Ligand binder design. Sequence first.
Ligand SMILES: CC1(C)S[C@H]([C@H](NC(=O)[C@H](N)c2ccccc2)C(=O)O)N[C@H]1C(=O)O
Ligand SMILES: [Zn+2]
Ligand SMILES: [Zn+2]
Length: 242
Amino acid sequence: GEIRPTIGQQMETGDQRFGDLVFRQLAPNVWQHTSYLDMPGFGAVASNGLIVRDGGRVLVVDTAWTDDQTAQILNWIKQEINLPVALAVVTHAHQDKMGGMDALHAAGIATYANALSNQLAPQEGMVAAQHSLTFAANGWVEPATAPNFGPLKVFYPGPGHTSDNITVGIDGTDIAFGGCLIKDSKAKSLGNLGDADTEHYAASARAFGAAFPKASMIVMSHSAPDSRAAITHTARMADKLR
Ligand SMILES: CC1(C)S[C@H]([C@H](NC(=O)[C@H](N)c2ccccc2)C(=O)O)N[C@H]1C(=O)O
Ligand SMILES: [Zn+2]
Ligand SMILES: [Zn+2]
């Protein structure tokens, strides 16, 4: 019964299986969602996002791979937290991060992505978010484009895994989320570099670290949460691309 991914972390102590998904509490008001894409002849690919309780509402970072899996996330939220889901931020226009947009929209959840992610979305087979985030030259989100974001601190580190990749810190916690930009401290590969900026990747990884200097728990798309060594190692792998 247990899902054993070909890519992505395995289930460990602290993980809750719910439907086709896995959930792990990371802090009093933060959970990691994990969903799995089954590739025939290859196996499962795990992808991770976040769920944040901020006061009386829930904020989501990234969809699951599919609409149905994303609906399962909303069902888990209903059963375990039982608060309205106010908004989602999705971290670039690829299936692991935006495959479930229709499910969010059907539920009345407001969605936000980098303007560039919304521009790329149809070209990448994704439904665009309803609202566009824009960024200063230093990478920080323009505040008026991210209204009522609670503790979420949204940072565009520069082109890396993709040109549109964004990252999210959770103020008042030890957590920062690198999405697919960051790989864990023991990874041997940066994953899919097909859409990547190999010249600028290393600087973008370092910029993420410097934007969230305090965070000790680095959450990412395809590994369990790691130390800041994930940032250092990702940057060192990326140095080799130049
Ligand atoms: C885990 C991945 C190697 S695949 C994923 C993403 N790819 C997709 O979402 C594709 N739709 C896909 C196609 C076939 C099999 C799995 C995923 C990407 O290209 O960044 N993120 C990659 C990554 O984070 O390095
Ligand atoms: Zn991607
Ligand atoms: Zn990915």
